[PDB]
């Protein structure tokens, strides 16, 4: 990783991340088979089997009832809408009786099938069968003459094992109205996700990355309940297709840059913070914190959560004072001292009335910081202290650079009125 | 449903939703009885019963420790405060020792009771007794001479079945400090929610609605823990009363309307997006994204999350150019290309430097869009593409209408300064 401090606007850009951007979805339609549990009944009264069988039947019947500018809120709202709208489209293709019949009839011969749905989407289909096998081959033989207080106690213990997956899928879809926000191990085992990844029209570059980052795959995906169809539950898992990979990405973080004019503070803060990537000859901004999860150099984002931004927006990093591009800022008379922790260091703003220090656990206080912004590289100290609040710095190493320049807050005069402004272009803050 | 595209202000209004607005709370006070588990003890050391009995006792002792403008934030803060303040107000009423005695003595002869608290609020009361019956009638007979490594292995398995509910109520209240966010199946079985719904002081219209939408009932409600009392645990479940029903509701979604003159952009975005309903001749706005939940035509909202708005605010949907009403907008030099997905279509904003297209899975690219706002009805295409990001449209059918008119951003000049403004009235953006 490489981090440039941008003294002209108290901001850092950390470069050197590799994109993993979710371009599309891949569907595994799971059929989970419960069997004729509702055709079983217990006459004996008190019974471990009856308690387990009644719980299994209740889960099946409740599942029968379930069926599916400030750019941050804008983009992450759009991404939430886009994901569920994409998934429900596939769900509505599946929902047809003819198609669930086609899926179910394919999975008679095999535990795995590929279906080309009538709407043209090609989906994997998987049978979860262990519970129907238990219900039919053993439990139905054990519940002879509707007796259920059988001495074969191994039946009852086994029953509470085989149904556990089914109960959790029911619970998760019940709690989430049929759209589970992440793919539980109950929806899809690792043995099934690895099979799905192996069976997914993508390059081995994605295949290796997806098998290494199975947890990131598992959390970027989601599930939809299709419904219950007699003795079986149909649901779909959506897996992320990461069709943009290894492109450049960077993160901007910024802290309040302030200066004292007539003895009174003028401040600016950059509002264009967060993740940026290049996609196919365009730069895309990911304005909300809930998307671009990051592991090592790999930054994982929903492409639907992106806002396209002109390539010239890089001039808000390299010489924001000269560019004619409308760099988004907030400005005003509001000198907030704070520590913006960053991948390779910390932006420390401290202003009159607040004391600011850096230290190491063994050295003690390494330095007392000047009023202003200081970029403390994470080798300069172990901690930054503000107001006696202690902030820990990251251990991770990398290149750190300083693009020197007189702060905008100092080099330009504040606008006489209105001085406080929010999410405005910089030419509007400073004369 | 019916959707009008509003070309004057790049927004859609989707109409035809039916209100289900939460006006009040119905209380079921659960008593769950654990019994004299803490008077039972195991001498044998290693034992399945001892492990289960110790876990049962630990759960009981830990539960003894537990006890309870940008309008979107302000509306949902008010709604959260209102819900807990109403719930605690009832909880405070039930806490009295004479009152929990009254409830407990009522449920001593019946599994269900109706109590009128001294506050004059009448609440349902429900016993959960299966664990006390197990502890008293069977386990206390099995544990003779404090022996617990008994050969009757059915006891230990049964014990792990009966206590499972108690452990989950404890876990949920322990994790949520006694105010759970939704009513778990462990707090209230479906067999109990159906009984509570039947007992509610409500019309059969809401009864049909609430039994069909049981998951929406279960998710709008919450629990409060009252306390532990003599080896019984007292908690209340708060169920929604939907006293405003079937009234008109509509959703506004908007995307940036931008126009170029002298080669430079003027943009506006409407900020009054989200849900509106009519209640008792008032029009009410629900600016919180987290409250209003939709199932078909029925839109389910907390009335406490509503902000009352003049009926003349509908003029921002028909005459935003000329109404004297302060239609709330943000404006500036910020041409964000984006897709606002909407019930019956998409608002597609695309502007200089960004390519925008629509297509179908079986036809290819159907059209290339002009710069500006295009309302793509969900019959026009299966997908919209922006910057090569692909957005999938909804399958739901309905009437789509277009209220033609010159975009406001074209009809008026941007104010020379301050050109960028946040959540201002429209007369303040345009000269």
């Amino acid at each position, epitope marked *: 990783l490489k981090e440039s401090y941008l003294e002209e606007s108290c901001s850092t850009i950390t470069e050197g991340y590799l994109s993993v951007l979710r371009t599309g979805w891949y569907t595994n339609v799971f059929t989970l088979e419960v069997g004729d549990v509702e055709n079983l009944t217990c006459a004996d009264g008190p019974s471990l089997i009856k308690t387990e069988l009644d719980l299994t039947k209740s889960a099946l019947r409740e599942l029968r009832t379930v069926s599916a500018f400030v750019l941050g809120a804008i983009a992450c709202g759009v991404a939430t809408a886009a994901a569920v709208t994409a998934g429900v489209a596939i769900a509505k293709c599946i929902r047809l009786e003819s198609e669930v019949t086609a899926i179910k009839n394919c999975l008679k011969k095999t535990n795995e099938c590929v279906s080309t749905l009538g709407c043209g989407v*090609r989906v994997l289909a998987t049978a979860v069968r262990e519970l129907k096998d238990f219900v039919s081959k053993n439990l139905t033989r054990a519940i002879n003459k509707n007796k259920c207080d059988i001495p074969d106690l191994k039946m009852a213990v086994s029953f509470s094992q085989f149904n556990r997956r089914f109960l959790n899928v029911v619970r998760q879809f019940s709690d989430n109205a049929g759209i589970t926000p992440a793919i539980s191990k109950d929806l899809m085992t690792d043995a099934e996700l690895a099979r799905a990844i192996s069976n997914m029209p993508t390059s081995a570059g994605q295949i290796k990355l997806m098998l290494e980052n199975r947890a990131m795959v598992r959390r970027k995906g989601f599930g939809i309940l299709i419904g219950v169809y007699g003795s079986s539950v149909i649901y779909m898992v959506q897996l992320p*297709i990461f*069709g*943009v990979i*290894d492109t450049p990405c960077w993160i901007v973080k910024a802290a309040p840059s302030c200066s004292e004019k007539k003895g009174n503070y003028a401040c600016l803060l950059r509002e264009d913070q967060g993740w940026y990537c290049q996609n*196919a000859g365009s730069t895309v901004y990911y304005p909300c914190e809930k998307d671009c999860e990051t592991r090592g150099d790999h930054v994982f984002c929903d492409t639907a959560a992106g806002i396209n931004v002109a*390539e010239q927006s890089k001039e808000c990093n390299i010489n924001i004072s000269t560019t004619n591009y409308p760099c988004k800022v907030s400005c005003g008379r509001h000198p907030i001292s704070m520590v913006a922790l960053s991948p390779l260091g910390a932006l420390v703003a401290c202003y009159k009335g607040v004391s600011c220090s850096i230290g190491s656990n063994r050295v003690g206080i390494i330095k007392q910081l000047n009023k202003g912004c200081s970029y403390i590289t994470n080798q300069d100290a172990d901690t930054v202290t503000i107001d006696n609040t202690v902030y820990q710095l990251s251990k991770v190493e990398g290149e750190q650079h300083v693009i020197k320049g007189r702060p905008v807050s100092s080099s330009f005069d504040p606008v006489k009125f209105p001085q406080d402004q929010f999410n405005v272009a910089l030419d509007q803050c400073f004369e | 449903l019916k959707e009008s595209y509003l070309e004057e202000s790049c927004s859609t209004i989707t109409e035809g939703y039916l209100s289900v607005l939460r006006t009040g709370w119905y209380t079921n006070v659960f008593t769950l009885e654990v019994g004299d588990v803490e008077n039972l003890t195991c001498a044998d050391g290693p034992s399945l019963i001892k492990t289960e009995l110790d876990l049962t006792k630990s759960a009981l002792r830990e539960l003894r420790t537990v006890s309870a403008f940008v309008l979107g934030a302000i509306a949902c803060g008010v709604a959260t405060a209102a819900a807990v303040t109403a719930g605690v107000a009832i909880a405070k009423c039930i806490r009295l020792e004479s009152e929990v005695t009254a409830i407990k003595n009522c449920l001593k002869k019946t599994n269900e009771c109706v109590s009128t608290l001294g506050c004059g609020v009448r609440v349902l009361a429900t016993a959960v007794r299966e664990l006390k019956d197990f502890v008293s009638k069977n386990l206390t007979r099995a544990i003779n001479k404090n022996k617990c490594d008994i050969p009757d292995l059915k006891m230990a398995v049964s014990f792990s079945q009966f206590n499972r509910r108690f452990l989950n109520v404890v876990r949920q209240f322990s994790d949520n400090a006694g105010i759970t966010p939704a009513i778990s199946k462990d707090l209230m079985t479906d067999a109990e929610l159906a009984r509570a719904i039947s007992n509610m002081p409500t019309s059969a219209g809401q009864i049909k609605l609430m039994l069909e939408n049981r998951a929406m009932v279960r998710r709008k409600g919450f629990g409060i823990l009252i306390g532990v009392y003599g080896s019984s645990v007292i908690y209340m479940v708060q169920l929604p009363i939907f006293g405003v029903i079937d009234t008109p509701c509509w959703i506004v979604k908007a995307a940036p309307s931008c126009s170029e003159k002298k080669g430079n952009y003027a943009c506006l975005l409407r900020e009054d997006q989200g849900w509106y309903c009519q209640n008792a001749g008032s029009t009410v706005y629900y600016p919180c994204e987290k409250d209003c939940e939709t199932r078909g035509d029925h839109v389910f909202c907390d009335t406490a999350a509503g902000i009352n708005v003049a009926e003349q605010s509908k003029e921002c949907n028909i005459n935003i150019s000329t109404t004297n009403y302060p239609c709330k907008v943000s404006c500036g030099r910020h041409p964000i290309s984006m897709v606002a997905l909407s019930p019956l279509g998409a608002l597609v904003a695309c502007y200089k430097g960004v390519s925008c297209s629509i297509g179908s899975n*079986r036809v*290819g690219i159907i059209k290339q869009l002009n710069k500006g706002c295009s309302y793509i009805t969900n019959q026009d295409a299966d997908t919209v593409t922006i910057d090569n990001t692909v957005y999938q449209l909804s399958k739901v059918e309905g009437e789509q209408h277009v209220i033609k008119g010159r975009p406001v951003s074209s009809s008026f000049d941007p104010v020379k300064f301050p050109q960028d403004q946040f959540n201002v009235a429209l007369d303040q953006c345009f000269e």
Partner: antibody, heavy 124, light 107 residues
Framework: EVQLVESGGGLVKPGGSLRLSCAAS????????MNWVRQAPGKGLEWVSS????????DYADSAKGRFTISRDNAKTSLFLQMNSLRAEDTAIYFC?????????????????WGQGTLVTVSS | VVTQPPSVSGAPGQRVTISCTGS?????????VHWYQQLPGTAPKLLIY???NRPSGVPDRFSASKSGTSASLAITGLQAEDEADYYC??????????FGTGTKVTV
């Protein structure tokens, strides 16, 4: 104009080694995957190799694997193919092509901008 | 190996269809099919950037489809400027990028 322009192709003997260089211009080269495609005279297009946008991934045909090496410089905006142990069967026009993927249904790249091609003749 | 007819012909204004055929590892694995055109000695021009999708500069008389293990390109209103090679392309789960055997349209 967005242009890819091949260079360094020519005449070599069997067992020979050669290094193709394709200069990219007019586009943000660091954003795109880049491929080499070859055409034997009078024959069809054969995919030769692929390199990802930040060089973190590369793949080759079974004819090229181990023999060839694809690399890129993102600052000089230039794509390179080292070829070792060339054979008569490697006589082809080699095209650099910019690789782009929609990624919605699957990840298979189309090649959108194609270079001019450089001839390579391998004969004794 | 994705396979194509060696040549097709038609009078001007006729409709000619080029078939493309594959296997469970490429077109049948779910990998989409792209189509390219090449006039003699020219570099290939992209005609269909995905299934169905045409880039700019490709008249509406070109059309393409994918259907399981196979794909097709149809040139309606065949014209003298169309007398080119055409190649389908996909991706093979083992062989990576696979081009078809190519087709000369003859007018």
């Amino acid at each position: 104009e967005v242009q890819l322009v091949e260079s360094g192709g020519g005449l070599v003997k069997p067992g020979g080694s050669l290094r193709l260089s394709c200069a990219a211009s007019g586009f943000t080269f660091s954003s795109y995957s880049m491929n080499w495609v070859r055409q034997a005279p009078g024959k069809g297009l054969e995919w030769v190799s692929s390199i990802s946008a930040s060089s973190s991934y590369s793949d080759y045909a079974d004819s090229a694997k181990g023999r060839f090496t694809i690399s890129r410089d993102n600052a000089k905006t230039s794509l390179f193919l080292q070829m070792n142990s060339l054979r008569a069967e490697d006589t082809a026009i080699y095209f650099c092509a910019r690789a782009r993927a929609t990624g919605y249904s699957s990840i298979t790249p189309y090649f959108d901008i194609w270079g001019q091609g450089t001839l390579v003749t391998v004969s004794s | 190996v994705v396979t194509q007819p060696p040549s097709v012909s038609g009078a001007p204004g006729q409709r000619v269809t080029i078939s493309c055929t594959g296997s469970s590892s490429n077109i049948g694995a779910g990998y989409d099919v792209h189509w390219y055109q090449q006039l003699p000695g020219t570099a290939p021009k992209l005609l269909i950037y995905d299934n169905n999708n045409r880039p700019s500069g490709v008249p509406d008389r070109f059309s393409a489809s994918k259907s399981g293990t196979s794909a097709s390109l149809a040139i309606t209103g065949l014209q003298a400027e169309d007398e080119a090679d055409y190649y389908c392309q996909s991706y093979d789960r083992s062989l990576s990028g696979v081009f078809g055997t190519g087709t000369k349209v003859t007018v």
